[PDB]
Design a binder for this molecule. Sequence first.
Ligand code: FAD
Ligand code: CL
Length: 488
Amino acid sequence: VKNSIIWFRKGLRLHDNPALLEACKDAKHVYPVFVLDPHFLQQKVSVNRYNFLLESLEDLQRSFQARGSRLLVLRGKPEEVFPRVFREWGVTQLCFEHDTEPYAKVRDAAVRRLAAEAGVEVVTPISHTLYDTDMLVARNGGAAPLTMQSFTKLVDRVGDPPAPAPDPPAAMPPPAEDMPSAAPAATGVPTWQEVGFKEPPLTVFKGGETEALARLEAAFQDPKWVAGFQKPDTDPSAWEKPATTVLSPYLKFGCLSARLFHARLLEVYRRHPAHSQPPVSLRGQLLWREFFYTVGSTTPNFHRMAGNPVCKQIDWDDNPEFLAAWREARTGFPWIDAIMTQLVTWGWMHHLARHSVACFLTRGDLYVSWERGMEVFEEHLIDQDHYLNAANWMWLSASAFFSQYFRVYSPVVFGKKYDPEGRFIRKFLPVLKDMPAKYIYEPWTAPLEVQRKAGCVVGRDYPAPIVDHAVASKACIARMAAAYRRSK
Ligand SMILES: Cc1cc2nc3c(=O)[nH]c(=O)nc-3n(C[C@H](O)[C@H](O)[C@H](O)COP(=O)(O)OP(=O)(O)OC[C@H]3O[C@@H](n4cnc5c(N)ncnc54)[C@H](O)[C@@H]3O)c2cc1C
Ligand SMILES: [Cl-]
């Protein structure tokens, strides 16, 4: 008889899950497993992202209960848990989605070697990305494309992505009863209070496949908006209704299928011949995701500067004061401090909002290494993706993929073009809620009478700007030019 395990790590969904379909096919018992490390708190991670993962597991649990099954949250590490449950559950086949992250490759290798010892077949379909990213490299001659212009030419010659897999059966084979490692009191989905987190989550985006599908349908309620989508024209100061899809935390955890997303975009594009094209279109945004996965997975030390071949070695400063002020949202620039406040409260910011604070920290004003900023984003971002965060940080720091270091965003002017009243600032920085719009982006320029009228005396209620942009900008640019000449 066939008893199988469908191992969840990413791909926290039931739709377009070929690993789940193979695990259920001709199976008497199916053990849906997510492996949790309860000492992951002795190692970094905000309660916002970890609760998003927990809500995603709860959604999977309710979805499995509706089909006569159950989600098992096994505690411990994979290398110690699987050799036990292989013999206990009579497992003959192990199934999980392919992953290309460095720790995943080291982890999945040992798991496979442990399965071959137990006589367990391992099935690992590709479903987290649009294509077999190792196939794109081989199709291109054996190296990853380093520009989006050439990558888009490759995917057009490769063809349409594989279509999404059908939905699993309305009923699935349940786990066998009275198995000790399957005891419900030891395999339930924990809450954020039981894993050690002491402060509650504040983000407004809920995890789970159900929410991922609802956000997808909501974005497709207006097909003209999807067809004419242009990423650089979207509004970074929009928070009540964000200007983009906000599907990144669901695509990160695999709550939403990228191939399903891509399949729905082609349906709209076929009936809208004037639809936007890469790199600005919605489909182009998925290609940016696939692009950085293709390069990042084939580039050693991709998340670091030293040892990274595609990354420029720049003599960034070691300034713990600029990092702390930027990290704690007290730079003195309300546009920057509001975005960093949205980071710690929501775990998500608009793409151009991240451009502002990444440029401010790195090549624009403070000249701190993008590795330091990447560490801060990885902690608070609910959509933190190993390859995407690092690639866009090297982009904004002009260390890879991007070279126009003379283009420096203004922490004073950039936001005023969209939100002249500072509604985005007043929402996240409530201490500036009564400051007139003439000085909301420059509170230090307000007369002292006006500062007292608003209850925001610069230096007492809100900090003074840690740097003068005009001076700090002309100093980072000059050092970037020197770095770019010594970069050969
Ligand atoms: C410094 C910096 C760090 C970033 N860190 C990450 C990260 O760790 N995780 C993350 O998901 N995004 C990250 N990005 C990308 C971008 O800011 C977000 O992907 C985007 O804002 C998410 O909003 P959305 O889902 O509405 O995007 P949409 O505009 O709706 O795009 C749709 C999807 O395409 C992908 N996508 C969009 N923009 C990019 C991009 N520039 N690069 C790669 N894929 C993209 C995402 O999967 C996104 O969900 C970062 C950007 C910056 C500037
Ligand atoms: Cl600007």
